[PDB]
Amino acid sequence: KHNMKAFLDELKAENIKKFLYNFTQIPHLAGTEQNFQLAKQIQSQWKEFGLDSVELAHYDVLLSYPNKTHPNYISIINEDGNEIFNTSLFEPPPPGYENVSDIVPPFSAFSPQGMPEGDLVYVNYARTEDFFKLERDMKINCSGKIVIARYGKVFRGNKVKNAQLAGAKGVILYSDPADYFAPGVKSYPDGWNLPGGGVQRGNILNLNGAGDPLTPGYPANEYAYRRGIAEAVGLPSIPVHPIGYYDAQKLLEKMGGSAPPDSSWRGSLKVPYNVGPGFTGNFSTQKVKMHIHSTNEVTRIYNVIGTLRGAVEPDRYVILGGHRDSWVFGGIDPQSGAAVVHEIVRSFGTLKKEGWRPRRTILFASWDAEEFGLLGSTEWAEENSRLLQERGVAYINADSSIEGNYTLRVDCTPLMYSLVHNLTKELKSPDEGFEGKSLYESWTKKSPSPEFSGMPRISKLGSGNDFEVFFQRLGIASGRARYTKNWETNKFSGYPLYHSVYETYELVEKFYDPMFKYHLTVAQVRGGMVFELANSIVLPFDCRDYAVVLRKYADKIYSISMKHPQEMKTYSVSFDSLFSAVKNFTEIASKFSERLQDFDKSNPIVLRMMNDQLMFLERAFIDPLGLPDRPFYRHVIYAPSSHNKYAGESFPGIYDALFDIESKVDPSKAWGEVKRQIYVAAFTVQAAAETLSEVA
Amino acid sequence: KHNMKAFLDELKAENIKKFLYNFTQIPHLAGTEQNFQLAKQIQSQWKEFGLDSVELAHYDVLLSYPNKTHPNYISIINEDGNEIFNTSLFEPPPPGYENVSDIVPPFSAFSPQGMPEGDLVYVNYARTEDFFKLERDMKINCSGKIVIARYGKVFRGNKVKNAQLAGAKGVILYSDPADYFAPGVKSYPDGWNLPGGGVQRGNILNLNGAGDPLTPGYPANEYAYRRGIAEAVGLPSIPVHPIGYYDAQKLLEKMGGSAPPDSSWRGSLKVPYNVGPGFTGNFSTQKVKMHIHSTNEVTRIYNVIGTLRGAVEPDRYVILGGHRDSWVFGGIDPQSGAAVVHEIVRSFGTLKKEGWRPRRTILFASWDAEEFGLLGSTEWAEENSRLLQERGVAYINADSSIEGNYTLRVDCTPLMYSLVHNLTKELKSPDEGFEGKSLYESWTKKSPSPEFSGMPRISKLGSGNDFEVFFQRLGIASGRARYTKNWETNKFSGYPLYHSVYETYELVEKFYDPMFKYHLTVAQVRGGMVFELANSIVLPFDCRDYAVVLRKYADKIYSISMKHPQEMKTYSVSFDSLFSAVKNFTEIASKFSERLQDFDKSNPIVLRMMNDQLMFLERAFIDPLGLPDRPFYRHVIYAPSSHNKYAGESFPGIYDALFDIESKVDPSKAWGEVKRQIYVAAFTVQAAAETLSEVA
Ligand SMILES: *[C@@H]1O[C@H](CO)[C@@H](O[C@@H]2O[C@H](CO)[C@@H](O[C@@H]3O[C@H](CO)[C@@H](O)[C@H](O[C@H]4O[C@H](CO)[C@@H](O)[C@H](O)[C@@H]4O)[C@@H]3O)[C@H](O)[C@H]2NC(C)=O)[C@H](O)[C@H]1NC(C)=O
Ligand SMILES: *[C@@H]1O[C@H](CO)[C@@H](O[C@@H]2O[C@H](CO)[C@@H](O[C@@H]3O[C@H](CO)[C@@H](O)[C@H](O[C@H]4O[C@H](CO)[C@@H](O)[C@H](O)[C@@H]4O)[C@@H]3O)[C@H](O)[C@H]2NC(C)=O)[C@H](O)[C@H]1NC(C)=O
Ligand SMILES: *[C@@H]1O[C@H](CO)[C@@H](O[C@@H]2O[C@H](CO)[C@@H](O[C@@H]3O[C@H](CO)[C@@H](O)[C@H](O)[C@@H]3O)[C@H](O)[C@H]2NC(C)=O)[C@H](O)[C@H]1NC(C)=O
Ligand SMILES: *[C@@H]1O[C@H](CO)[C@@H](O[C@@H]2O[C@H](CO)[C@@H](O[C@@H]3O[C@H](CO)[C@@H](O)[C@H](O)[C@@H]3O)[C@H](O)[C@H]2NC(C)=O)[C@H](O)[C@H]1NC(C)=O
Ligand SMILES: *[C@@H]1O[C@H](CO)[C@@H](O[C@@H]2O[C@H](CO)[C@@H](O)[C@H](O)[C@H]2NC(C)=O)[C@H](O)[C@H]1NC(C)=O
Ligand SMILES: *[C@@H]1O[C@H](CO)[C@@H](O[C@@H]2O[C@H](CO)[C@@H](O)[C@H](O)[C@H]2NC(C)=O)[C@H](O)[C@H]1NC(C)=O
Ligand SMILES: *[C@@H]1O[C@H](CO)[C@@H](O[C@@H]2O[C@H](CO)[C@@H](O)[C@H](O)[C@H]2NC(C)=O)[C@H](O)[C@H]1NC(C)=O
Numbered sequence A, B: 001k002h003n004m005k006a007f008l009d010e011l012k013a014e015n016i017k018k019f020l021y022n023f024t025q026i027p028h029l030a031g032t033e034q035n036f037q038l039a040k041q042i043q044s045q046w047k048e049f050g051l052d053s054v055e056l057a058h059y060d061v062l063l064s065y066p067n068k069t070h071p072n073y074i075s076i077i078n079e080d081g082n083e084i085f086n087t088s089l090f091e092p093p094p095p096g097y098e099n100v101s102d103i104v105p106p107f108s109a110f111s112p113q114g115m116p117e118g119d120l121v122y123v124n125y126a127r128t129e130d131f132f133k134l135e136r137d138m139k140i141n142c143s144g145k146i147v148i149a150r151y152g153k154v155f156r157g158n159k160v161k162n163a164q165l166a167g168a169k170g171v172i173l174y175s176d177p178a179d180y181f182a183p184g185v186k187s188y189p190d191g192w193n194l195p196g197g198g199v200q201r202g203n204i205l206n207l208n209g210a211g212d213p214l215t216p217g218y219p220a221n222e223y224a225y226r227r228g229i230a231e232a233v234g235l236p237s238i239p240v241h242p243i244g245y246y247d248a249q250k251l252l253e254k255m256g257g258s259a260p261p262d263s264s265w266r267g268s269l270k271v272p273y274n275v276g277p278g279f280t281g282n283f284s285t286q287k288v289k290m291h292i293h294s295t296n297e298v299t300r301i302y303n304v305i306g307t308l309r310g311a312v313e314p315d316r317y318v319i320l321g322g323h324r325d326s327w328v329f330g331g332i333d334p335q336s337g338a339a340v341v342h343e344i345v346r347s348f349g350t351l352k353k354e355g356w357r358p359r360r361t362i363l364f365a366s367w368d369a370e371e372f373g374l375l376g377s378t379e380w381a382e383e384n385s386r387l388l389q390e391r392g393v394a395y396i397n398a399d400s401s402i403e404g405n406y407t408l409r410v411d412c413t414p415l416m417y418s419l420v421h422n423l424t425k426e427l428k429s430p431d432e433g434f435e436g437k438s439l440y441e442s443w444t445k446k447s448p449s450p451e452f453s454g455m456p457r458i459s460k461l462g463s464g465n466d467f468e469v470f471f472q473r474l475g476i477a478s479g480r481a482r483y484t485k486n487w488e489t490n491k492f493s494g495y496p497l498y499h500s501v502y503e504t505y506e507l508v509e510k511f512y513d514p515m516f517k518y519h520l521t522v523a524q525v526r527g528g529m530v531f532e533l534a535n536s537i538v539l540p541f542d543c544r545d546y547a548v549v550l551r552k553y554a555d556k557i558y559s560i561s562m563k564h565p566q567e568m569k570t571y572s573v574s575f576d577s578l579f580s581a582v583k584n585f586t587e588i589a590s591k592f593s594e595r596l597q598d599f600d601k602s603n604p605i606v607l608r609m610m611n612d613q614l615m616f617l618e619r620a621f622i623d624p625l626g627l628p629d630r631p632f633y634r635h636v637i638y639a640p641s642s643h644n645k646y647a648g649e650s651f652p653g654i655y656d657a658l659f660d661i662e663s664k665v666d667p668s669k670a671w672g673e674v675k676r677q678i679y680v681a682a683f684t685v686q687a688a689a690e691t692l693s694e695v696a
């Protein structure tokens, strides 16, 4: 039989290992020749593997690179202007790669050039609440100061935006061992910890879904009209640079001014974590000086797009996409994901060569320039937005397959909860101690849902990956899955070697997944989802699961508002319309589910009608006017948090209208806007419900 | 047989006459009790006629009414402040209606209140080019002046916007007999001309597609959050009032200052048409004073929505909509259209009672508050926008069925050109002299296409009617048809009794269509179109017709730009991308047409695929970001003219970037924006073409 079992059994751990090794021998930085070569390789292999067509889709987008003859670094400078201490110009390369060329040195992509000099303020994680505490409680003023912030907790672009609005003239980012060194584990190459010379690369944009900074709304094709740099979207106005903790120790050890306000501000280095401004008395006259000379440059990028044409509904697309560009070798990010996609393509192509075709069309993508702001996925989606919004069934992301070895992690739309529960009950757990048990069983045991019990945790989608344009802009049901760490017994952020030169094939083969069994499990979850989406006669979405979460999010946002009972009285702020809409959604979704069960299964137009109602249900939560000042975040239920792009926020329009509202100087105006956002959300919920009513 | 012939033969002239009489005995002003009664009547009749459901959809929207105890009027006032001449408080009612109550007196809906006093400037039609001529050539300054403008040529809301931007403090609108009195015809009741006491009502908003001024983007439902008046969309900032030509003669006869600049500025009254400012020497010290006391008020309106469920594709909607609210009796506008819709509903319901159902669902609408800014259609579409954009096949408008008795007028999307040609070849001409000939034949003879020869004129859609939200906001293929006058041998605007108390059942029965044969022909064209749209197995749209017009519009906009060859050189302004996209559209559309001819006709999914490509082709021309500063005009090929809402403009984004560009002070910026709009248009054309490519 050509069924999902045939597909799943064809997937091999050993193949994912071979592909990972093949993809991680040299750097594949976006916009470089090596990454164009790899694109051409993947294109040729996907053709050999059996796909119907495989094309490159290219764009010319704004990228950012250090100047190779004028390196970035930071100094402590004395009263005469002598640089008495300099940060590193490069990370010590790992064993056996000390002769690889074209390793890009640590930098913050899209930093402007400058050589600002000043006194340091230490701002903890540079979160919105960190600046509130500094400014409101401690009365420390960052205006004209250089801030130093530890990486972690939130996306770095939000740190830089927050420093910029506090009036900083520069930002230094560093990795504290409190957040990037797990107790009891050795530094790379001897374990998976970040060494003191290790540094995390990453862009510092605030694109809010725009894609290429110069062409928001339209693909950066050959005739594109581009904004000038001054009108570009999302670029920082102050220089920024990342360092490791050896270097950070040298900048922090001399800090004076106020003590840290409490222990949550102290990391693990042997320094006091004084906030400043500036250095203690003996050194009060030394300053910090940044030297940033990176340049932004329009550069060609290349996506690989493979098509496996559907036998029955070729005009319905199920998309498996993940990126290919890496900061250096990409051992985890992204090639552990790319290798899994490569093996999925291979397995599908095997079945195809024996005469099988999925019900619907499956599109496979190897995106470029994800590390520079989700540029490849976003420009392609801008180009193809009409096809995607009328034909797009689902998008499954495929970045890093592992960030730990403890249990499964899934973030997705409620419409996929049932599909994920059912698939994972049919897959074998790779976990020691759960031999012969289902993945569902091990996952639920290690990661219990906060709400349900007997059910696993499934998180809402945030952002910081290539599903953003598909989900929050276009409203196509989206999901992602990977193996992850135990967040309970671990205080550190993501995985320690993230976006460092130390993220290599060896890191993975030696320390994360030597048998490639977690990779294989993730290929089964991702591939199994694409299979069911592209092949099930009825799309495998359960609208009733959205009804349950909409009630949870309505309760949550009402609870937030109710911290202000006096104002809700004064301004007549009612959530009744939103609860009404959620109640109606629940009733209509229950009735639609009954018809879906009971409809005449021989009638394909009835079937195509009800599949279209299922496909367009995520689509119904899109507001074509977007969220306030964020036109490309159009989903009314989910947006990336305005304080942390990686986190999802529910009812974001109401959430941001309420945030910090007790500080607004015109409360009438502020609560007016809360009421406006309640009206928008209740309306959108009711409108989405009505797409599930009988059609006539 | 239940075929289109059965449908068409059931339509009766005598029934349209009975309904017209029934709908025009009392005023049906939006927001009034009489118009709610009529809604309830139509709802009950459409139920009796056989529709599956018929519901009222209500909204609470901003309307505008004079104050019944504080009337609007204009004065000439002397040096002491005595009002020596006053304009009329009402139009003399026609014979036999002198005792009808609740005739609303002439006013400009949405005028602010005020009693401004000042010197007159006469501004001809208050067109953009009229103000250019006054300000640039004649050096006349309107700041702080009251302007008087003749109705005609352009929508009155654009006149008021243009006066406001010239710094006027008030606007007086009047009907000149040059534009509203046809030579050789008598005034009502003895013919169809406008009497000197007749006055044209109408709103003076500049909504640009927003619908209710207080709730742009969302339906004005029970929990809607409303803007405050100061942030409302589209309201005028200066008082405005309309008058007839008896009164206008009294205001114009004393005018001094400059002579009219040429004969195109002179109407037919026995006055000099001096531009002013102010009156001649003897009267130089008299002034004009307006007294406006109308109020804007949120008021309930009611649409009637009837459904005839499709047998095969119930989730595909073909919509026949026209409004029901009138300024007074609505003898032509809108009830000559409403009576035609009523008879169409009756004919469809006859067939339904005998067991027939159309292939697709047909929705019938009786919209409210069209006269106040297309409010009813727009709020309903805002409410139902997700259903309409995923399910909407076509919208056929049904306002006035006649504005003359000479020949057919059709304005529609190119996608309907073939459908209209084919249907009209099968209908009988009602014209004298063409007995036994087709409607196509008489229409083509009397209204030859400028381009084609052997073909009839079909105009692009403009706006000022209820298709605007469906076509220019949502991108649903739209059309309209009516009988019209011979524009060649007639210099007057629209029809003379437009929006006057004299537009009665008698006007129609005595002077326009005593046999109701033009009404019947229009019911056949509108009803025949809805029939073919809702019943043809393949949707009756020809994409190749869009390809032909896109080339015509590209040639036209390039010709405009080429008036500036030096700047096109300096700023490297190329239309090559747009011509490329139009060429590709033509090639892809030709291939798609071949497949549509040759596809396996037994395969319904192939059929539903290709019908979806046809349905979503108009949809592809929507840009979700909208046109500059006009977010609800999202169609890139067609927008209402920025200088005249009634007229359509093609490639509007490029057109407005080029308009008056030689006057812009930063030419680099201006031509940059031209290039931006070329990129947007070429992109949108190519993207729409690609929706017709093979899907995978
Ligand atoms: C959830 O679904 C339910 C439908 O099951 C839906 O109920 C609707 O609620 C609205 C209220 O927002 C009702 O609107 C009323 O309609 C009647 C005419 O049918 C009007 O007369 C009402 O207005 C007048 O009377 C009201 C007193 O009830 C006054 O408060 C008001 O100021 C006016 O005087 C009012 O507009 C509507 O009838 C029902 N529809 C039904 C039951 O079918 C509810 O709206 C849905 N929730 C959301 C968020 O959409
Ligand atoms: C109309 O349809 C046609 C397809 O039949 C489509 O043609 C495409 O045109 C673009 C040009 O805008 C081509 O883009 C080129 O792609 C190649 C790689 O395939 C690149 O190397 C090219 O860039 C380099 O080389 C160019 C020299 O030709 C340089 O001018 C450039 O600066 C770079 O060095 C270039 O990007 C594309 O290949 C074709 N696609 C085809 C033939 O399939 C055309 O774009 C459509 N019109 C619109 C408005 O979309
Ligand atoms: C995940 O798996 C569950 C369990 O198999 C799926 O729910 C089950 O779906 C089936 C198939 O439609 C339901 O069968 C129906 O039962 C009713 C009897 O009341 C009958 O009228 C229908 O003809 C049909 O046989 C079954 O009841 C249902 N089980 C439960 C507990 O809901 C679920 O659909 C799967 N989810 C996805 C996305 O596939
Ligand atoms: C308006 O009417 C015209 C004339 O009837 C329609 O064009 C005609 O459409 C028919 C039916 O599809 C075409 O028939 C095809 O002919 C080819 C032979 O080359 C054959 O391969 C197909 O199987 C089919 O028989 C016919 O050629 C065509 N005539 C012309 C002049 O184009 C037109 O489709 C109607 N428009 C609308 C919107 O209905
Ligand atoms: C990664 O794998 C690819 C495919 O096997 C290798 O590329 C092939 O290299 C062979 C030997 O040089 C050539 O003859 C083939 O034409 C290449 N195939 C393709 C599709 O490019 C590549 O060398 C491997 N890379 C590494 C670093 O191991
Ligand atoms: C930090 O680096 C800077 C720049 O390379 C060093 O300062 C330079 O030293 C060279 C060689 O002595 C001089 O010719 C340059 O004029 C100096 N440039 C600047 C900008 O100061 C500095 O010596 C280094 N400091 C340490 C401790 O290594
Ligand atoms: C317009 O036609 C309608 C329908 O015939 C008339 O309304 C009917 O009036 C009769 C007699 O008064 C009532 O018994 C019916 O119940 C009414 N029907 C409906 C559906 O309302 C109406 O009177 C006519 N109006 C005019 C001005 O002629």
Ligand SMILES: *[C@@H]1O[C@H](CO)[C@@H](O[C@@H]2O[C@H](CO)[C@@H](O)[C@H](O)[C@H]2NC(C)=O)[C@H](O)[C@H]1NC(C)=O
Pocket (backbone or CB within 6 Å): B081, B082, B083, B084, B085, B086
């Ligand atoms: C135009 O109308 C105005 C307002 O009704 C008239 O002026 C009023 O005349 C009455 C009766 O004599 C006075 O009591 C009011 O004080 C006047 N009001 C104002 C605002 O002036 C005026 O007489 C009318 N002019 C003509 C020619 O009919």
Ligand SMILES: *[C@@H]1O[C@H](CO)[C@@H](O)[C@H](O)[C@H]1NC(C)=O
Pocket (backbone or CB within 6 Å): A067, A068, A069, A070, A295
């Ligand atoms: C990089 O720096 C070098 C020398 O210090 C300079 O000549 C060149 O302008 C810079 N390159 C870029 C791309 O800015």
Ligand SMILES: *[C@@H]1O[C@H](CO)[C@@H](O)[C@H](O)[C@H]1NC(C)=O
Pocket (backbone or CB within 6 Å): A141, A142, A143, A144
């Ligand atoms: C912070 O410092 C800047 C720079 O001198 C000053 O202008 C600004 O007002 C200060 N703000 C506060 C709250 O002290």
Ligand SMILES: *[C@@H]1O[C@H](CO)[C@@H](O)[C@H](O)[C@H]1NC(C)=O
Pocket (backbone or CB within 6 Å): A192, A404, A405, A485, A511, A512
């Ligand atoms: C792999 O799992 C073991 C056993 O729980 C754990 O001690 C180790 O930290 C894991 N490795 C990584 C990289 O997480």
Ligand SMILES: *[C@@H]1O[C@H](CO)[C@@H](O)[C@H](O)[C@H]1NC(C)=O
Pocket (backbone or CB within 6 Å): B067, B068, B069, B070, B295
């Ligand atoms: C209308 O005018 C009368 C009297 O001149 C006044 O009492 C009332 O306020 C006005 N009505 C409205 C609705 O403004």
Ligand SMILES: *[C@@H]1O[C@H](CO)[C@@H](O)[C@H](O)[C@H]1NC(C)=O
Pocket (backbone or CB within 6 Å): B141, B142, B143, B144
């Ligand atoms: C028009 O008149 C106003 C009002 O006094 C004046 O302020 C404005 O500058 C004038 N414009 C021109 C071009 O004369």
Ligand SMILES: *[C@@H]1O[C@H](CO)[C@@H](O)[C@H](O)[C@H]1NC(C)=O
Pocket (backbone or CB within 6 Å): B192, B404, B405, B485, B511, B512
């Ligand atoms: C009706 O047609 C006749 C004959 O052409 C014409 O003289 C008359 O003006 C028409 N009536 C109207 C209202 O257009």
Ligand SMILES: [Ca+2]
Pocket (backbone or CB within 6 Å): A210, A211, A212, A214, A215, A216, A217, A218, A219, A220, A379, A382
């Ligand atoms: Ca772009």
Ligand SMILES: [Ca+2]
Pocket (backbone or CB within 6 Å): B210, B211, B212, B214, B215, B216, B217, B218, B219, B220, B379, B382
């Ligand atoms: Ca509205």
Ligand SMILES: [Cl-]
Pocket (backbone or CB within 6 Å): A397, A398, A399, A400, A465, A480, A481, A482
């Ligand atoms: Cl992922």
Ligand SMILES: [Cl-]
Pocket (backbone or CB within 6 Å): B397, B398, B399, B400, B465, B480, B481, B482
């Ligand atoms: Cl019309």
Ligand SMILES: [Zn+2]
Pocket (backbone or CB within 6 Å): A323, A333, A334, A370, A399, A400
């Ligand atoms: Zn990644």
Ligand SMILES: [Zn+2]
Pocket (backbone or CB within 6 Å): A333, A371, A499
């Ligand atoms: Zn990354």
Ligand SMILES: [Zn+2]
Pocket (backbone or CB within 6 Å): B323, B333, B334, B370, B399, B400
């Ligand atoms: Zn009308």
Ligand SMILES: [Zn+2]
Pocket (backbone or CB within 6 Å): B333, B371, B499
């Ligand atoms: Zn009208």
